[PDB]
Specification:
Two copies of one chain form a homodimer.
Chain A lengths: L2 E6 L7 E3 L2 E3 L4 H7 L11 E6 L11 H14 L5 E5 L5 H11 E2 L5 E4 L12 H14 L5 E5 L2 E4 L4 E2 L8 E2 L7 E2 L14 E2 L7 E5 L6 H7 L6 E6 L9 H12 L3 E6 L16 H4 L3 E2 L5 H12 L5 H8 L11
Parallel strand pairs in A: 1-4, 1-5, 5-7, 7-8, 14-15, 15-16, 16-17
Antiparallel strand pairs in A: 2-3, 6-13, 8-9, 9-12, 10-11
Helix pairs in contact in A: 2-3, 3-8, 5-6
Family (chain A): Belongs to the asparaginase 1 family.
Enzyme class (chain A): hydrolase
Main location (chain A): cytoplasm
Chain lengths: ~325, ~325
């Protein structure tokens, strides 16, 4: 019989509906699951719940909380066959992305999921989300950080919260789902032992270009203590041919700031290869973020900046597919 | 006698020639080609006039000054035609459509912005179908709004964003159904000038220090892209910087990072800590609508409080009441 470790970090799935909003009730998740017979069928794995105290609203997640979850998996790695993380939906995609970088050579499934509604309610997907995450963490041989939502298993570092709320809140815009669990439509390295990278908060600006955007506004984004800037640009990665903008980006890159080009588009790739582009951004030292989500690029920069790497070492690794987060152009 | 449509060729690939050195401008190429394409001259097609801008604008180089040039061009032609088709590069098409929706008050004729990523001539090119369809719809199914037409879909302009980084299905209107699946008072033209706006995305552990720099001079407004239905970390380090900015007259607008759905933070009726820090809801606006709407409002003689009020009112169909 497989055994799964479940961290209840937070989220509405285990809470109680009240007039004053959803409220945490200690042990409520575990008491309810003991009485839901679907969770105890012969084909289901055994599972153990570690309920965080206090639970975290995912909007209050920090990189220290990423590290706490990674450490929890590392502590428990040899004791279980797989891992389920229960988490609020607001920043679930950030946590999934961060954990994919942090857990190198992962060779057991880690599946993050949750629900915006207490799981006893008919409108809640929490029962089906946790049932499937438990079953797949036990039986499905994808040894990656995945996110389960609306009967779909997505690669964690390709996920974004695509709808503000609702049962279909997550998408993987630049990668096919790993698995459909309900209705059907017609892989990174694990060679060598688990390595759990340390991550700390990093001063990163995430900004959007728009017509007429000033050098003065961009200069402010690149003031200390910024170490890296994610620029959200047009189409396949285009920005205005404006010396006052390009000069500020070049000054930043020349003093070791890592400046990364992502598209404002929901889907598709930046096409700005460093040796093979006329993009004036590339001449100002900006690197391509290919088809990364904001979540992947922001967590990948945390991962790389938290180690002992030079600016040039970070720029190279930002452009390399490390954990399945980006597609070669 | 037929409807008459003014076509401004402002820029984009549609009228250009493919070359080893990428697309090059050829003055008069679009107009010459259309004269020889019989589909443009059938009974249901309007009469049209092409005006080719010189130089053409690469839409990635668009400024608010170029928004104004296009608005002024529509104003000067407004009484001479039944409707207006603007040909434009795809990179910033949604920003121009959004800006023109605010600038052209009491618009009572169709304005359709469109374009193509392939020259008109090229086999199975959307140049021919996008321009042909836009001319057909402006004449035969007029919607008296700034609309964006692409890939057999007529979208409300100030509800559009670039969906795919490239390709035939470049545009979407995530928070409003298409105006068409195609398978009071006189015109006032408002002035817009460039405005110092910061457009930022929050993330876990974002610091007070980084947020403080987003709000330094000359910033007059900040679009904050936040989580889900408009949530941000509860930490005083962030909310204090936003409250200090609002207290000195900076307009801070809450948009969702989600491509679809709404911020849920009505001004008088929200437990949001953000609202206590002076942050206002941008409802379900696109980034394009919020950024162009701020340009529009900051370019007039309105106080910060007047801008905050008008930012939360549906002025041109850009946002939905919660």
């Amino acid at each position: 019989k497989k055994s799964i470790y479940v961290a209840y970090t937070g989220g509405t799935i285990g809470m109680q509906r009240s007039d004053n909003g959803y409220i945490p009730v200690s042990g409520h998740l575990q008491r309810q699951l003991a009485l839901m017979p679907e969770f105890h069928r012969p084909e289901m794995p055994d599972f153990t719940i570690h309920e965080y105290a206090p639970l975290i609203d995912s909007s209050d997640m920090t990189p220290e909380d990423w590290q706490h979850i990674a450490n929890d998996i590392q502590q428990n790695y040899d004791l279980y066959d797989g891992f389920v993380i229960l988490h609020g939906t607001d920043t679930m995609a950030f946590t999934a992305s961060a954990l994919s970088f942090m857990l190198e050579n992962l060779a057991k499934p880690v599946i993050i999921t949750g629900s915006q509604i207490p799981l006893a309610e008919d409108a809640s997907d929490g029962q089906t989300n946790l049932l499937n995450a438990l079953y797949l963490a036990a039986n499905h041989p994808v040894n990656e950080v995945s996110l389960f939502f609306n009967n779909q298993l997505f690669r964690g570092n390709r996920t974004t919260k695509a709808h503000a709320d609702g049962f279909d809140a997550f998408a993987s815009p630049n990668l096919s789902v790993l698995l459909e669990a309900g209705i059907h439509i017609r892989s990174p390295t694990s060679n060598g032992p688990l390595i759990v990278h340390r991550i700390t908060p990093q001063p990163i600006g995430v900004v959007t270009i728009y017509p007429g955007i000033s050098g003065a506004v961009v200069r402010n984004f690149l003031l200390q203590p910024v170490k890296a800037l994610i620029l959200r640009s047009y189409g396949v990665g285009n920005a205005p041919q404006k010396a006052e903008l390009l000069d500020e980006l070049k000054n930043a890159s020349d003093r070791g700031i890592v400046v990364v080009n992502l598209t404002q588009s929901i889907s598709g790739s930046v096409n700005m290869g460093g040796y093979a582009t006329g993009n004036a951004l590339a001449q100002a030292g900006v690197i391509s973020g290919f088809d990364m989500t904001v979540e992947a690029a922001l967590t990948k920069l945390h991962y790389l900046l938290s180690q002992s790497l030079s600016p040039n070492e970070i720029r190279q690794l930002m452009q390399q597919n490390l954990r399945g987060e980006l597609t070669d152009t």
